Amino acid sequence: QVQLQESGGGLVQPGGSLRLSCAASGFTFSNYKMNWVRQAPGKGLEWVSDISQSGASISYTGSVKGRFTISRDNAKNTLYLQMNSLKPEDTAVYYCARCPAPFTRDCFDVTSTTYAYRGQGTQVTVSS
Template sequence: MLKNFNVFLFSANCTCPKIPPKSFTVQEDGCFEGKYRYKCIPGYTRKPTTSSLIKCEEKNGVSQWGESNFECISKILLFLFHFFKRNLYHVSAKSFISKEREMMVKRPQEVLSLSCRGSGFDFSRYVMNWIRQPAGKTLEWMGAISDDGSNTAYSSRVDGRIEITRENSNSLVHLKLSNLKPEDSAVYYCARDAQ
């Protein structure tokens, strides 16, 4: 049986000055063939659309590191929000109608603000709900707002951090969740209540 091993030797003798520090990265000295690749500390991962590679370049006779947009973000706070409008009490795989999909990244203690627009029904006649589904878990009801917006009810799990409001004139329901925690990572849904 053959095994392949990729071995990279780092040289402490880079012609460039010290590697520019980045937040939440493992600090190492040295480079390989004039290149350096940042690594995130445990619990963090590379932010999409950023590159971990920087190159040692010569400009005007001086060796210096090129520009880098690299950023590490917390793995546990990658949020995927998926909005849908449907009768809350008749939820099945066939009844989900995707309205929007959006990936959002938040950090602990930040505020999450989401809006969902209803269509295809008389929005002002229905109680609207926010529910969520953490990875590998069942749906969790977060709260609801009455058809005229005068009353709200919230789950004890998020009470004190959640606010649900609505704009019937624009068929919109809003969710505001403050002081975010790792356990808030989930797929979020808005849904209309049964009549």
């Protein structure tokens, strides 16, 4: 029974900061690769960042590079995103996703067609 539950989010102001957490259960956490995706009102799903099995390779998208920081804790099976200096364009729902197979170097996990190994998401609103 694969389960992923997100925590954090809420309403903040420009220039603020937040810390989103993702707790996983039902699989061997350290065998898989993890990533963060988001969906904005009136748009589709967008890939934000990814981190590998150990944490020696990290990848960011162009617009959030330098402001976000991803990390994982393998002993407590947790994923963390630290968001700094928010902007109004960062108002969206955020999801924590896992790649389909272990010991593998690629992933197909952004589909709207009900990808099975991601969570329910958490809402982040930035406004005055």
